Amino acid sequence: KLSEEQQHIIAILLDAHHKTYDPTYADFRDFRPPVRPLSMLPHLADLVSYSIQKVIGFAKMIPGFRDLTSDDQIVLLKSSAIEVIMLRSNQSFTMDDMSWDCGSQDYKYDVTDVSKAGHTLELIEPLIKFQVGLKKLNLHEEEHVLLMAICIVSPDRPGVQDAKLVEAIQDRLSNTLQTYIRCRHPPPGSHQLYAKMIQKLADLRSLNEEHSKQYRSLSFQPENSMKLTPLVLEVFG
C-alpha cells in the first residue's frame, strides 16, 4: 500500500515532468540549426542548454529539494544535469533505429550526429547500450519521474555539505519507488525492477565520467567552447 504521502509525491513529480518536458519538441525551432567536422555542435549545445533549464525546473519541484541550502542545490544540479538529460532523453529514444526522434527528420539524432558534436564511441556506444537497457525496462511514467528525482538528490555527489539531509530526501523518494513497484507494477515486469533501476544510476555515473572527460577535451579548444552556451559553460565547466 502506497501511503497518502507517497501518492502525493508521485502526483507532484508527474506534474513537474509534464510542465518541463514538451513531447512535441516545439521549442527546437529556436535552436541554432542542425547541419549534417563539429557541425552538430551548435544545435546539440543549444539542445543540452535548453535541457539543463528544463532539468532545473523539474528539480525545484522535487519534494524536499527547496529545503536544501542554495549551495547544495547547486552541487546536486551541476553533477546530475548530464545524467538527467541522458535519462529524460530515453522518452525520445527509439530502438527502431537506435536514435533520438524529436518529431521530425531535422530533429532526429543518431550516432553520427553525436559524433559530429565532438564525441567518440567511447561515450556513444555505452550511451546507446544504456538507452536500450533503459527502454527495455518499459518503465511506468511514475517510475521514470521517481528515477530522475532520485538521480538529482544523491547524497554522494562530491561537494555536498548536508549529506544527511540529501539522504533523507532521497530515501523518501526511494521508498515511494520501492512501494510503487510492489503495489502497482505487475509481475513479470516488476522482477528485481528496483535493483535494475538502481543499476541504471550506476551506469549514469560511468557515462557522466566519460562525458566529463570528452567535454573537457572538446571545450579546452577555445574555438569549440566559443560555440557552446553561457549556461553549458557555467554548468559543465
Binding site: Q53, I56, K60, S70, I74, K78, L231, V235
Partner: peptide
Amino acid sequence: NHPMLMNLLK
C-alpha cells in the same frame, strides 16, 4: 560562482 544556475533556482 554560478550566477545563471543560481537565478534559475530562484
